[PDB]
Short mmCIF file of C-alpha atoms and ligand atoms in Angstrom, two decimals:
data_model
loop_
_atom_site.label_atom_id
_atom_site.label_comp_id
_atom_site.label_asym_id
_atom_site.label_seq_id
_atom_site.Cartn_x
_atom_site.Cartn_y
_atom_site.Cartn_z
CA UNK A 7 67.37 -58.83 28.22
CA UNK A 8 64.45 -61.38 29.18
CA UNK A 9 64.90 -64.62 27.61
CA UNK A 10 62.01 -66.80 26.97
CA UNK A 11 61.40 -70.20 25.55
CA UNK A 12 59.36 -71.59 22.52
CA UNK A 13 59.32 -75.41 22.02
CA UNK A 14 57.76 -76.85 19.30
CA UNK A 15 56.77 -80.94 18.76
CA UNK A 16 57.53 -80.46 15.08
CA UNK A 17 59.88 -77.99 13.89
CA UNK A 18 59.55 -79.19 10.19
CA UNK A 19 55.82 -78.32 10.10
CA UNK A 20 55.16 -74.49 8.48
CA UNK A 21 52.61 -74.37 11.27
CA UNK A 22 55.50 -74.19 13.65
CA UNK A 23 57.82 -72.67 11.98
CA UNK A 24 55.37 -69.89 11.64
CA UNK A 25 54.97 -69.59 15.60
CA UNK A 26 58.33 -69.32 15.85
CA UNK A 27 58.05 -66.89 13.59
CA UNK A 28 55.46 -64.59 15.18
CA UNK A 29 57.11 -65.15 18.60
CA UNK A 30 60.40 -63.43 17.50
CA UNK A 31 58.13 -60.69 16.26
CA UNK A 32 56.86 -60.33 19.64
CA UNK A 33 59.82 -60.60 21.20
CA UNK A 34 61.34 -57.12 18.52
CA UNK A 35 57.85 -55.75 19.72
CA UNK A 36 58.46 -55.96 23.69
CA UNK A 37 61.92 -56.74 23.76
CA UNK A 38 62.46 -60.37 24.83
CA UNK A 39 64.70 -62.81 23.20
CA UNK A 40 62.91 -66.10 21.94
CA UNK A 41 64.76 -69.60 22.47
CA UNK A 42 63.62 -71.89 19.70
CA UNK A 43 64.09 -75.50 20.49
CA UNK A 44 62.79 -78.68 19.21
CA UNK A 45 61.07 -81.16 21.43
CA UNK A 46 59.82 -84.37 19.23
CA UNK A 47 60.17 -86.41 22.37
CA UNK A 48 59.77 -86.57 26.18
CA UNK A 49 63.07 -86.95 26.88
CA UNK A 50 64.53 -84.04 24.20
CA UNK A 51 61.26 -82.17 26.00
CA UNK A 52 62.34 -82.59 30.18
CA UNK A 53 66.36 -81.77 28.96
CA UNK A 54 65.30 -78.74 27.00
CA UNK A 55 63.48 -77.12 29.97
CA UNK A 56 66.91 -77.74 31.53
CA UNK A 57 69.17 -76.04 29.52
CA UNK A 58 66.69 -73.09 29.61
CA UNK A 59 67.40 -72.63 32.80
CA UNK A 60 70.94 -73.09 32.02
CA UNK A 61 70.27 -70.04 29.89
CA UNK A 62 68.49 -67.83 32.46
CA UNK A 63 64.74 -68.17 31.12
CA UNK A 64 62.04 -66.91 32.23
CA UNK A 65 59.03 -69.12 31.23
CA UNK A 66 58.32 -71.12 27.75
CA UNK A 67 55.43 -71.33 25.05
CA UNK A 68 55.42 -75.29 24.38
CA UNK A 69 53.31 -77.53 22.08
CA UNK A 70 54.09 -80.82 23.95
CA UNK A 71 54.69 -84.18 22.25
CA UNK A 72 52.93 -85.86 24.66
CA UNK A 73 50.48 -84.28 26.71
CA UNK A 74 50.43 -86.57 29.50
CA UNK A 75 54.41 -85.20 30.09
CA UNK A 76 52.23 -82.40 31.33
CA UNK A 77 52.53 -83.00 35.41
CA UNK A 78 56.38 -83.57 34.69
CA UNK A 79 56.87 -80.37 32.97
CA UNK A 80 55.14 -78.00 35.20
CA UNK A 81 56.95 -79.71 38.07
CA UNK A 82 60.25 -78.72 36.19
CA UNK A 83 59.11 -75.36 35.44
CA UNK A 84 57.98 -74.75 39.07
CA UNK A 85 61.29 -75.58 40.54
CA UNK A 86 62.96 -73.38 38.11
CA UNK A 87 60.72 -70.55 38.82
CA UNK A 88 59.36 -70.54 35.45
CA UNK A 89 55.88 -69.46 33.77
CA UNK A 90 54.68 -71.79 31.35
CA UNK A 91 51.78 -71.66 28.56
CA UNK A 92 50.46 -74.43 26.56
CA UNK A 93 50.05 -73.69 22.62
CA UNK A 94 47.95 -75.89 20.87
CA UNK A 95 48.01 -79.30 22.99
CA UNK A 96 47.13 -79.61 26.21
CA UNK A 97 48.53 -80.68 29.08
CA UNK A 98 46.69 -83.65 30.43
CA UNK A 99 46.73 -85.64 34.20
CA UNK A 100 47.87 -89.49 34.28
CA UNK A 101 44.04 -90.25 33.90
CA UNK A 102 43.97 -88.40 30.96
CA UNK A 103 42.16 -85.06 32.53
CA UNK A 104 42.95 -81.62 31.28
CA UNK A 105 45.09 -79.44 33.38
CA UNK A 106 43.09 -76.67 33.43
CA UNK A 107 44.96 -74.17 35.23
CA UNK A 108 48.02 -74.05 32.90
CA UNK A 109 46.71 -71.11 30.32
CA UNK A 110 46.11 -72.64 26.92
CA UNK A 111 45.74 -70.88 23.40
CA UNK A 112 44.29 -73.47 20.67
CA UNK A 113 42.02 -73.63 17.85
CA UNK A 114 38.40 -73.72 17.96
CA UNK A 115 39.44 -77.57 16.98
CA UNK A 116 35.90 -79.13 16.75
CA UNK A 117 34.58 -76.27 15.27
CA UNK A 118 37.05 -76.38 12.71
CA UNK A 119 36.80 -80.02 12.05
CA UNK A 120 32.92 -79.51 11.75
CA UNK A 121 33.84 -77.03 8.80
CA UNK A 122 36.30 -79.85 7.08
CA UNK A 123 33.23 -82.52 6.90
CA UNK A 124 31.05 -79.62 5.40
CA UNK A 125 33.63 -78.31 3.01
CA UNK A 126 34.26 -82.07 2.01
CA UNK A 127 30.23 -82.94 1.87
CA UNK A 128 30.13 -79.80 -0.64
CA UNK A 129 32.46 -80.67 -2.50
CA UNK A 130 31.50 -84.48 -3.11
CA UNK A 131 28.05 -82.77 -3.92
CA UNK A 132 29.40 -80.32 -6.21
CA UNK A 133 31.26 -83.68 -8.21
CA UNK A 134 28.18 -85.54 -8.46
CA UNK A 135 30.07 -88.82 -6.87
CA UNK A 136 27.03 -91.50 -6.21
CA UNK A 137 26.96 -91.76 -2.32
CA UNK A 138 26.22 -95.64 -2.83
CA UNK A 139 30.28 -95.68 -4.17
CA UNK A 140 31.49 -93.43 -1.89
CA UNK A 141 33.47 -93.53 1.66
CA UNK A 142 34.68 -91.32 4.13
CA UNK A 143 38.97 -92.45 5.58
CA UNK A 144 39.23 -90.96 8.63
CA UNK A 145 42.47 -91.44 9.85
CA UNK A 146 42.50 -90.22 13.50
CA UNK A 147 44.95 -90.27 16.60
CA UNK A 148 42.27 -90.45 19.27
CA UNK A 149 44.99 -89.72 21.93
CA UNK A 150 45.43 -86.63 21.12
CA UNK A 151 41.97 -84.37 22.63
CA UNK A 152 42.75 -81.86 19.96
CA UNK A 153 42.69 -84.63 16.64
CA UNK A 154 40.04 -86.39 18.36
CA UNK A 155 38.03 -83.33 18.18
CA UNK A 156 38.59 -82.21 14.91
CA UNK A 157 38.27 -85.53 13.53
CA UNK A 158 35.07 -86.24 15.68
CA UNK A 159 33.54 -82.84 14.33
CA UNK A 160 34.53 -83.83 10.69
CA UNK A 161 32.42 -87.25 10.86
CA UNK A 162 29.58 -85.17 12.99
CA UNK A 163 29.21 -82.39 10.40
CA UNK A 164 29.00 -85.42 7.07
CA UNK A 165 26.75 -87.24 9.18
CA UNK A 166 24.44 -84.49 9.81
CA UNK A 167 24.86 -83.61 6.28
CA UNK A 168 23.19 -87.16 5.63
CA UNK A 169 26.67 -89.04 4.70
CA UNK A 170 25.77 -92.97 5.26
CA UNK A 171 27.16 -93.60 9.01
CA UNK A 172 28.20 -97.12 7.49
CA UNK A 173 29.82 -96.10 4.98
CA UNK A 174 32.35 -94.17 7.91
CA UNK A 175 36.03 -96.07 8.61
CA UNK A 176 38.23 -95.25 10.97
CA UNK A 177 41.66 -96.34 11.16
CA UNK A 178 44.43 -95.17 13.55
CA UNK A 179 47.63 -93.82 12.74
CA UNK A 180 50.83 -93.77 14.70
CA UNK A 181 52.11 -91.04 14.08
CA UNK A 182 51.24 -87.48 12.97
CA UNK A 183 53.12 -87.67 9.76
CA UNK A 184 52.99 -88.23 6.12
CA UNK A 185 54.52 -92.20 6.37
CA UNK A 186 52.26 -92.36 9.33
CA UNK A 187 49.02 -91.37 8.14
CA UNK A 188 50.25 -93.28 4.79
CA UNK A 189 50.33 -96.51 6.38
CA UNK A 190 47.21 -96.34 7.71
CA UNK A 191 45.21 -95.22 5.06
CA UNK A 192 46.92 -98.41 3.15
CA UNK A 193 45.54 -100.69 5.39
CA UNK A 194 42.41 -99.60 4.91
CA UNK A 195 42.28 -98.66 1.07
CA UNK A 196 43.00 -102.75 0.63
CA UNK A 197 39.82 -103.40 2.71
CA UNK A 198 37.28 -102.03 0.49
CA UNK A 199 38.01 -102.66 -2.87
CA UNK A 200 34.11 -101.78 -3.64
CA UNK A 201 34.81 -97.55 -3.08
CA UNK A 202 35.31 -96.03 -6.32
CA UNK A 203 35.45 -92.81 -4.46
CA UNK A 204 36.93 -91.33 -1.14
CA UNK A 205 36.79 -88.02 1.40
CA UNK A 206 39.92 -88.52 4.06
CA UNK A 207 39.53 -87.07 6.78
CA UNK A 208 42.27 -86.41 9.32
CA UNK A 209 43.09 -83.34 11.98
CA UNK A 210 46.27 -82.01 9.78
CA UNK A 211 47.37 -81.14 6.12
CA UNK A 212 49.82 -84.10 7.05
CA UNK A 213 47.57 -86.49 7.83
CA UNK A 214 45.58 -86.06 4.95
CA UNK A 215 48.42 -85.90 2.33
CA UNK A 216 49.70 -89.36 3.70
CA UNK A 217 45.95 -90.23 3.30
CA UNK A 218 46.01 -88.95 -0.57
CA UNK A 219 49.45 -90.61 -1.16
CA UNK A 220 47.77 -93.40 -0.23
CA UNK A 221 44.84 -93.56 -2.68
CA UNK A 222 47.33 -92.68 -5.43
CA UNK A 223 49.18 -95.79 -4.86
CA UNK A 224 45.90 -97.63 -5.17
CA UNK A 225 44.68 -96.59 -8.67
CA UNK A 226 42.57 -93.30 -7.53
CA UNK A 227 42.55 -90.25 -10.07
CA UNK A 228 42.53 -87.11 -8.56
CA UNK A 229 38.98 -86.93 -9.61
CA UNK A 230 37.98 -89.89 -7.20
CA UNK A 231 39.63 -88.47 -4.29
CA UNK A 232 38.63 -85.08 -1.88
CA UNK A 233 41.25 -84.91 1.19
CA UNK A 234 40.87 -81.38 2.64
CA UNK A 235 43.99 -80.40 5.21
CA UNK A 236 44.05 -78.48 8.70
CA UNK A 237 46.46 -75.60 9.32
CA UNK A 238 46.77 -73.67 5.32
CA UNK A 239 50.43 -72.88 6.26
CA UNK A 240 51.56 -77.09 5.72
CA UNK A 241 49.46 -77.45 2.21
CA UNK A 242 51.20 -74.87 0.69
CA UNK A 243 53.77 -77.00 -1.44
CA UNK A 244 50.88 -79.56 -2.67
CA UNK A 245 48.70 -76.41 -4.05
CA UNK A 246 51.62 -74.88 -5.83
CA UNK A 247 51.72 -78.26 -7.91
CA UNK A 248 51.60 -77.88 -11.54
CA UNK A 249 48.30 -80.63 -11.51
CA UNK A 250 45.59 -81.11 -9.68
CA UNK A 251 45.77 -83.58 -7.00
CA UNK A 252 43.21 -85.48 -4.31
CA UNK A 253 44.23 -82.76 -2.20
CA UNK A 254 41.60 -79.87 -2.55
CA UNK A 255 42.21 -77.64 0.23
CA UNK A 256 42.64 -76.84 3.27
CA UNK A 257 41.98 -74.38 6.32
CA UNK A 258 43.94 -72.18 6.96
CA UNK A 259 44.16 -71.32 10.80
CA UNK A 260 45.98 -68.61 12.62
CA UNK A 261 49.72 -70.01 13.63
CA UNK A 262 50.50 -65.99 13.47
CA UNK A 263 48.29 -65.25 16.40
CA UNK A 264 49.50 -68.53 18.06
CA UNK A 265 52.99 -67.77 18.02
CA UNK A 266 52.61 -63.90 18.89
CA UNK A 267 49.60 -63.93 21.74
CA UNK A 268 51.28 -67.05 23.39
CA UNK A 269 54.38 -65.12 23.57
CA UNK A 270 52.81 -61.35 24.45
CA UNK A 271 51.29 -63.45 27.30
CA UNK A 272 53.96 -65.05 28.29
CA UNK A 273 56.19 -61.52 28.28
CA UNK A 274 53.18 -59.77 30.34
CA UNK A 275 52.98 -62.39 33.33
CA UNK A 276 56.28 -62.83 33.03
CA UNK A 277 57.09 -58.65 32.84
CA UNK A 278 54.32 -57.75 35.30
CA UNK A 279 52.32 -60.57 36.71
CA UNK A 280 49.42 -60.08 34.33
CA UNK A 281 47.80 -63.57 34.88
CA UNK A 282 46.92 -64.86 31.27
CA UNK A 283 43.17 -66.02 30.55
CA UNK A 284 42.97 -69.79 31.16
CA UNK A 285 41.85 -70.88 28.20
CA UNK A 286 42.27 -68.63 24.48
CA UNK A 287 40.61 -70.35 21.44
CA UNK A 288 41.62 -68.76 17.97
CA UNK A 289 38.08 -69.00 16.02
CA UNK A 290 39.75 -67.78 12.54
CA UNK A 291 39.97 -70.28 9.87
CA UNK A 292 39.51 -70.05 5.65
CA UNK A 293 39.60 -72.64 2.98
CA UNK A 294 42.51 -72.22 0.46
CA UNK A 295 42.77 -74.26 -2.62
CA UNK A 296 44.67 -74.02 -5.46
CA UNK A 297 42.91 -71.55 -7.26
CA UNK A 298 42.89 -68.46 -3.92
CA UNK A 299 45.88 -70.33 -1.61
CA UNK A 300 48.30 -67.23 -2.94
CA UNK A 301 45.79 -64.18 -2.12
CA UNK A 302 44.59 -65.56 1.41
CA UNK A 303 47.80 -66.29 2.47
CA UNK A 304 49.08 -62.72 1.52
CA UNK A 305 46.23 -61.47 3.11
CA UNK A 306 46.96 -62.62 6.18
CA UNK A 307 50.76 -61.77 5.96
CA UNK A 308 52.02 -65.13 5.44
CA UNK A 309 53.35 -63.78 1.90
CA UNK A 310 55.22 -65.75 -0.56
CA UNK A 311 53.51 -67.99 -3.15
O1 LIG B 25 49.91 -81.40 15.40
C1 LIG B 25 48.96 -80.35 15.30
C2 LIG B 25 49.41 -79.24 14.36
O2 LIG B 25 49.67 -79.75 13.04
C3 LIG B 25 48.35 -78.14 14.28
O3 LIG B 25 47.16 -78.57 13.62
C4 LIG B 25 48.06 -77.64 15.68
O4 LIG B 25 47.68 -78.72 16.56
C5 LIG B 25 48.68 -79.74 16.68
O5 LIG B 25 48.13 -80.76 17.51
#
């Protein structure tokens, strides 16, 4: 029958693949096919939308890899007489203005980041690290509204906690990745030989792993090192480790609502012009580390170790 779309920026991340995931379920619930494609790039992204017409779709769920592709995309969509909704990134004007009226469903991203700089604050507290030794990486991709916001809410929530502003470097990474955020966090780890001990912050579990890689390359015990992750689904394969690493957690979000909702909207204005709500922010979020990762996952239905 119907046949809609769900593009994804990163098909190797479990976040995605677990959108995909939920979408198909949606699709068995209301009976729609889902057309899983992977758009790293602008040019993979305009093509797709393309062959999905080829294909007879409807409308399309997409997490962008650029959200300034936005005007482009709805352009394509509107001559194809397709519904679109954003999941997770927004679509931004050339100026770098949200486009509001393209329905959105996202995490409560500052929010979220807010509870990273606490759970990392705690944590420090809870190791007894002298602040006077200590530093917070955050390794951010300011670009991006949604990392800038959970990275921005981090460094609110450890300042407000009473973390040393100065003792707060930022350095930029290129990409969204594990090599990416590695880089970075190299760059700056050779800078500031006097930290014996670090937080990373960054807006993903991938971001922060390339962060921890990092510090391992550079002498740091696990001890020395507290890098909690964004999204639960990615950290899954660093918590089923058989040692401890700098890697203590992270929060797990809601890809499962993501993927379905987006898709159940989609379906309804698609099915029955049933306008979506503009703007849908998924509030849920826990902190799984090694020692709970396999019950809150199974909890939420994301089963298997
Ligand atoms: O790239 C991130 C993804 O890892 C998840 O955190 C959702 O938001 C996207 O921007």
């Amino acid at each position: 029958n119907l046949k809609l779309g769900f593009l994804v920026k990163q098909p190797e991340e479990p976040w995605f693949q677990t959108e995909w995931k939920f979408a198909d379920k949606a699709g068995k619930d209301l009976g729609f096919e889902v057309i899983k494609i992977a758009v790293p790039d602008g040019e993979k992204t305009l093509n797709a939308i393309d062959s999905l017409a080829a294909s007879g779709a409807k409308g399309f769920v997409i997490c962008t890899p650029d959200p300034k592709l936005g005007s482009a995309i709805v352009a394509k969509a509107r001559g194809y007489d397709m519904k679109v909704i954003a999941v997770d990134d927004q679509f931004v004007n050339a100026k770098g203005k949200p486009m509001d009226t393209v329905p959105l469903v996202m995490m409560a991203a500052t929010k979220i980041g807010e509870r990273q700089g606490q759970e990392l604050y705690k944590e420090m507290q809870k190791r007894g690290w002298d602040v006077k030794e200590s530093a917070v990486m955050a390794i951010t991709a300011n670009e991006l509204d949604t990392a800038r916001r959970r990275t921005t809410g981090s460094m609110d929530a450890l300042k407000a906690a009473g973390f040393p502003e100065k003792q707060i470097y930022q350095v930029p990474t290129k990409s969204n990745d594990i090599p990416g955020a590695f880089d970075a966090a190299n760059s700056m780890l050779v800078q500031h030989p006097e930290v014996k001990h670090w937080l990373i912050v960054g807006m993903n579990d991938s971001t922060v792993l390339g962060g921890v890689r990092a510090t391992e390359g550079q002498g740091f015990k696990a001890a020395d090192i507290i890098g909690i992750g964004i999204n639960g689904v990615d950290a899954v394969s660093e918590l089923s480790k058989a040692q401890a690493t700098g890697f203590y957690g992270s929060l797990l979000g809601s890809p499962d609502v993501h993927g379905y909702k987006s898709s159940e909207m989609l379906y309804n204005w698609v099915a029955k012009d049933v306008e979506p709500p503009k703007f849908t922010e998924v509030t849920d979020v826990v902190l799984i580390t090694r020692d709970n990762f396999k019950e809150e996952l199974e909890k939420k239905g994301l089963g298997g170790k």
